[PDB]
Structure formats: structure tokens, C-alpha cells
Design a protein around this ligand. Sequence first.
Ligand SMILES: O=C(O)C1=C[C@H](O)[C@@H](O)[C@@H](O[C@@H]2[C@H](O)[C@@H](O)[C@@H](O[C@@H]3[C@H](O)[C@@H](O)[C@@H](O)O[C@@H]3C(=O)O)O[C@@H]2C(=O)O)O1
Length: 609
Amino acid sequence: AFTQAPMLEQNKQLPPVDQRLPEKPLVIKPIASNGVYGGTLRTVMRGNADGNGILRTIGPQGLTHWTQDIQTVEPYVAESYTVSPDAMEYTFKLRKGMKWSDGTPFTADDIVFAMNDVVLNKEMFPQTPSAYLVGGKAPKVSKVDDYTVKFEFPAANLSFPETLATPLGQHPTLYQKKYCSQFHPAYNKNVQAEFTKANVKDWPSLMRAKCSDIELPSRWSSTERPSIDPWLIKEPYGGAVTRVVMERNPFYWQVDPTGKQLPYVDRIQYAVVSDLQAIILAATNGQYDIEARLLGSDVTSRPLMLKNQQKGGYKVFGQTSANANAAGLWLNQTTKNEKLRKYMTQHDFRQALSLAMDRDEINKVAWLGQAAPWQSGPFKESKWYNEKLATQYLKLDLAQANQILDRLGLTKRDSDGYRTYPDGGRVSLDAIVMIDRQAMVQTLELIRRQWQKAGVELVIKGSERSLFYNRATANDYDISIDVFPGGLDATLNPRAYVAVHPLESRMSLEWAKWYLSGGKQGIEPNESMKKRMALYDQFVAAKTQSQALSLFKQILQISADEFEVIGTVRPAVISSLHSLKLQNVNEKMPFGWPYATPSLSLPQQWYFS
Ligand SMILES: O=C(O)C1=C[C@H](O)[C@@H](O)[C@@H](O[C@@H]2[C@H](O)[C@@H](O)[C@@H](O[C@@H]3[C@H](O)[C@@H](O)[C@@H](O)O[C@@H]3C(=O)O)O[C@@H]2C(=O)O)O1
């Protein structure tokens, strides 16, 4: 019936391929042509907390999957699903005979465990991941039969199929009950004895160490953790390693239109590189079969990238980024700097800071003129376009900026020429940045010089990714620089407009913590944010598309009125590459986190000619 990769003939112990596949495997139509088996996919990740590079290469294996044009989703791990007319009850039919990577059955037992015993367990997650919540309230997940599972939300949830296609929506398929139950007190009477083995002190830490989460490095650091991924870890991430190797999953659950069990490619090899510049040189020498993640936003190197295409044996292709802003200033409304906070919370202060910026210079210098000035709003083709949110305060007006700061009472000056607070102290903002992000650091250096003309001091504090996230969650920053999503993905990724993302809504993560705990932790936000949060809960629970359109447009307008985050430039074209020998890469796919790119292009059907 079906066939398998020749390298699998080398494992005597494997059942015949028809018995490893579901009775009805998901048939994957290829991007361009039917493929052939073999080869090793060479790509790259960074050394510091870059496990999402693996996830965005092999792809989240969720209940649904985006179409190539990201306009809709289709059943993926689920064979099919039905929705009740009121959008509250979702019933998923699973593929009979489907198996985990260890050969054991993948059934509704696994999805019910993942939801009820892990995701929805409040000791595991004191705040339930919001992907599964409606207005902060959880669904009831129940087994219908071995191959049918039901989600019952307490209100309409029109967007749940889209959520289930994003990386943060993939919990339902991430936890094998058999393996993970040994680390759960509800199942292992002796789970305590597992703590000393893993050097943890409680079972949630145990569960994270052994069974992982969406973005934890532990997801890729063991070989024994079962999954339904197209490739499995063989040489793990985590240690002081310079290379990660994944190998085809003999129990992968898909075929191509001729009946070949996928993936076509036998192995993936990630170079784990300590420094950016080395990635650039190896890429320009053709050492990577695909790179469409780390080098996409470095306009400085596309001349050499383009130049060495023929010598390196690769093709450069452009992608449209979903981000509204390539490098935006998240201003901390809950900055611990008491003197600064009195001005940070004033609209006109933030407006002055934006008017003192010269986005044409940033474009020219940091982006070789290939980006364009923008704040944080959706693009004009978006049904969510808001002119004010996109274009207010974009033109340099130093005189106007200085007049505002004068009017706010920052008219005293120190010996170096900077403005001071009325009661002493230089007007100074600390900006945290990831040191490996060259365009972002360069953006802050240009802004520092620009804001000096307004008598304001910007202080650059660079670190690797871990400490950068640690400082943010500690509320230890005045500014954080990173992308503003929303150009194309505003409802999937609304972090810049309302403080709902626990790690990335950095107008205040204490505000987000307040929202995500029902006001039990964190810092109560101001009236405009509490208003947007209430509207956001109404939007997620909207009964009709017209109500959802009205509600979310209200959120964007309030966000525009408030002007809480300051954009520099919307992204230039994303520069990606793949080997000329690598076939079936969708060179037209958009770029972005909610689609896990480049894995949106279905890497299980990439192949080498
Ligand atoms: O080289 C870069 O630094 C870079 C290239 C991308 O072209 C650019 O859009 C930007 O990627 C952002 C973000 O800076 C990067 O850290 C990563 O973040 C996502 C997600 O947004 C985060 O919330 C977290 O989940 O980690 C993710 C990850 O992939 O690690 O990717 C985004 C993006 O747009 O895809 O930086």
C-alpha cells in the first residue's frame, strides 16, 4: 500500500510501514513536485535560548494547520472537526491507528491528558495559557471515544481553529499521556522519587524538565520524550553543543500523493553558532540548505548574499513580514524609576520622544533605505487599518519635541546639556536590547544621538536573549526594543495594542500579569488599558464577525489615542535563502511567528534533487 524511506530498511525492529501509519494518513500535496527520499538538511540556530529555531524548522504539529496563503486553516493532526452553530463546542476526529514516535497509540486519551492534566492544571500553569481561554475562562475538554475529543467553551470562540494552527496553540498534541504521566502526581504515587533524578523540587518543575512546554529548551534536550514530529532529536540541544541532529520519525503520520511516508529528507543538522557574523559567512558560503529566520532582517548583508548566490549554490527569495514594525520602542508604563514614571505616563512626553526621532536616518543607515517609517498599526491592505495608529508623529519635529518637554517642566539643564527633572537627575531612559540583533542595536545608537538633540539620554543595555527576557519579566527596564506585530497578524498577535502577552506586551508586563490573573497579581492598569482589556475579552467571545470587527477596531483606536509604543520602521523585505538543490520551498509564503515560518511551507515535503 504505502512505502517508506530506504534508510528505514536498516532497522530490523520496525513493523511494516502500513502498520506504523494511520489507517488513513494525511496526504500532503507538494508545493511544486513529488519528491524523492534522502539527504541531510543543514541549517542554523544560535547558542542562547534559540530552541524556537527548531520549532520553526520542523513545524508545530497542531490539530489544524495554516494554508499556504494563511487566510484559513485545515484539519491537520485531526482528521476533521465539527463546530456547533454557536461556535462554543469543537469536536475533533482523530486519525485511527496514528502512533507516537515510540510506536504507541496516539488517541483522545493523549489530548484529554494534555488539556486537563497539564494545560488546565493550575499548579502546572497558575495562569492557563490564554490560547485556550475565552474572556479568561477555560473550556471543558472531554473524551468522546478513543478517537474523538470535545472542547466546550463557555462563550463563542470563532477564532479557535486559527489559534490551534499557531505555535502557542499546540499544547493539545504535545504530551504523550503514557510517558508524561510518570511525572504527574495524579498518576505516579511515587512522583517524589523523580525529583532528585531531575534536580528539581516540585512536580511542575519536573514536568517542565521532562515533558517541556512550547518554548522551553527542554523540548529539544532529550531523546526519550515522545512526539508526533516529522523528525526526532538524536543529538540534543541544551548542553555546550555546537550541533543538533534530528532524524526522521519512523511513525510519522503523513504520505505524499504516491503513498511515500514523509518526510522526504532523512535528517536535519543545526549548527549551533555562538555569534552572528559567523552565520552570515557560512550562509554566504552556501553551508546552509535553508536559512529563513535569523538573517532575514539584516539588510547590511544582502549585497553579499545576492552576490554569492551562484558561488554558494543557493537562491535568495524575499518574504513579506507580518510585523508592523521591525524595531519598536516598548515604553514601560510601570518603570520603577519614580521620577521618570511621572513623565513616561504622559501622552505628550511619549509624543515628544517620537517627534525627536529621525526615521529617515534610521531607514538610511540601519536599513540601507529599504524599510520605511511606520508606527505600530496594521498595514493599509488590512481590514484593521487605522491611519492614526500607523502614521501619527512620524516626521521629525525637534522644535516641537523641545517645546513639549519645556511645557512638561523639564527645563533645567545639567553641565553636559541634558534636561533634568525639576528636583534633580538627568532625564534618562534605559533600553534593553539583544546584543546579537545588529539592526536593533544600531537603531538605538542612532536614537541616542537624535534624542540628545532633545536633551534626553538613552542608555543602551545589551544582553543575550535569556537575560533580556529575565529583565523584562522583572519589570527592570524603561524601554525594550523588539518587533511590533500587527501589520498582517493583528488579531493573532495583538501584543502591541493591549497588554495581554505575558512576556511581550512590554508597555507593562505587570499590567499583563494583572490581566492574566484576573486582577489578582501584577499592577492594575490605567483606565484606557482596562477598557481595552474588557473590549478584548468581548472580542474573543464575539458572537458575530461584525461585532468582532467593531470591538477590535475600538481597541486599535484607543491604542492610537494613547500612543504607548513608538515604532521606527516597518520591515524591509525579508531576505531568505535555500539551496538550489532543495525543492518544494514555498518562496511566496509570508514571514511570521504565528505561522512558525519557515515551517509554514511543510518541511516534511522539502526534498533534494
Ligand atoms: O534576526 C532577527 O533578530 C529577527 C529576524 C526576523 O526577521 C525579525 O522579524 C525578528 O524576529 C522576531 C523576534 O525578534 C524574534 O526574537 C522571534 O520572536 C518570536 C516571537 O515573536 C517571540 O514572542 C518568541 O515567541 O520567540 C519567537 C521566536 O521565533 O524565537 O521571531 C520574531 C518574528 O518576527 O518571527 O528578529
